């Protein structure tokens with residue numbers, strides 16, 4: 284179902300009278316807008332086009348009020364201009380109040396560049412759009428957000444660094460990380476947040492757990508106190524929400540006999 | 541049925557091998573073309589991209605051959621460029637011959653401005669187009685040509701001028717005029733072509749007829765000899781074809797007792 288048509292003044296191309304007023308309500312499908320232009324336009328000129336006019340509207344917005352033969356200082360004439368609707372709807376109105384030929388206009392549905400919406404990549408197509416993510420993330424079910432793939436990694440070295448996905452840059456939204464540090468049965472590991480610590484707060488909640496002992500929920504803008512664990516195996520959980528601008532955290536683990 | 545999709549190198553985002561070659565054949569509906577662009581593009585560089593490449597083709601036309609990471613003097617890289625197919629068809633080919641991540645591309649069907657066809661007015665819409673004419677003409681059945689409305693007019697004055705529709709400018713195509721000069725029963729009218737005479741020739745045929753007596757077929761580039769009729773009523777027939785640039789004719793009729 285293609286959308287396009289033609290509109291003309293009463294009695295076109297003959298002279299129009301002043302006992303017939305007109306309106307046309309044009310509708311394109313969702314995702315489209317309508318473009319209209321005039322091939323012939325000849326209406327009497329009057330201050331602010333109050334006597335004779337062609338008015339273009341979208342919803343309550345008044346896109347334009349036309350009249351005359353040649354645009355002036357306070358009255359506008361279509362010329363060869365193209366008018367676009369705001370939304371998939373356009374209303375054209377023709378009025379005349381008590382020698383002019385009137386007008387001929389054409390309209391056609393046209394695609395809307397809907398990426399004028401997405402977390403990472405916005406892909407536009409005819410009638411709609413969709414989103415995609417960068418390498419390392421996977422589109423969420425909200426179809427717009429990019430969840431990070433931050434789980435399944437483990438640390439075996441005596442000491443190492445951990446952090447939020449894009450540290451020191453805003454971390455993924457609607458993500459849920461899970462970091463792991465596994466060491467020999469003897470050793471004992473101590474964690475201490477380093478550099479910066481920035482997490483959305485009022486707990487975006489960072490939780491550190493290990494065989495009987497819960498830490499957190501951590502949030503806020505300052506390095507939380509250092510933590511001396513018991514185990515040689517610790518797991519960290521960082522769940523996020525949509526808030527973007529938050530640098531995140533970075534932990535430097537270490538262990539001793 | 542909306543057209544759009546995604547293409548990637550073997551094993552994307554992992555490094556690609558060299559035992560798998562690829563092609564995708566994209567098809568948009570008549571009236572549309574496909575646009576494609578790369579979100580990720582990382583292929584090994586080689587002179588004229590002979591070892592690794594992404595080739596874009598439309599029919600037999602080679603729109604582009606890609607490779608590398610950054611365009612150079614003899615090798616091209618997508619960058620953030622957008623590629624459009626020629627016609628409603630696009631073919632993407634990926635090759636590799638014996639550390640690079642490959643590529644991710646997206647494509648979407650897009651409308652073709654088919655008024656890049658018509659006699660007078662070309663109107664474009666999604667998937668096709670149509671034609672319209674200026675005031676005084678009516679679209680022919682070929683859906684493209686503008687026939688003139690040159691019939692039904694009569695002349696009653698003792699003397700008057702007649703001519704081709706846009707004299708002295710190219711006359712309408714596929715038109716068929718019929719002029720009439722009616723005078724009192726007594727008078728007798730004489731016709732003589734004036735100014736210019738330009739009609740498509742080898743008879744576009746101008747014929748003058750009146751109660752028993754046929755004149756013509758007139759064509760050519762010079763004023764035809766003057767004609768003294770018998771009747772007080774004469775009718776002229778001018779039929780055209782597609783040839784455009786031909787000024788036409790102009791007759792100055794007169795009559796005497």
Ligand SMILES: *[C@@H]1O[C@H](CO)[C@@H](O)[C@H](O)[C@H]1NC(C)=O
Nearest residue numbers: 352353354360361362363364
């Ligand atoms: C519209 O464009 C034509 C060229 O095709 C130009 O001659 C004409 O002046 C323009 N009309 C107006 C008033 O904008």
Ligand SMILES: *[C@@H]1O[C@H](CO)[C@@H](O)[C@H](O)[C@H]1NC(C)=O
Nearest residue numbers: 609610611617618619620621
């Ligand atoms: C593509 O555009 C980005 C801006 O978003 C720019 O930083 C990048 O250099 C461009 N890539 C190339 C190689 O054209």
Ligand SMILES: [Ca+2]
Nearest residue numbers: 395408410411
């Ligand atoms: Ca769109």
Ligand SMILES: [Ca+2]
Nearest residue numbers: 652665667668
């Ligand atoms: Ca089109």
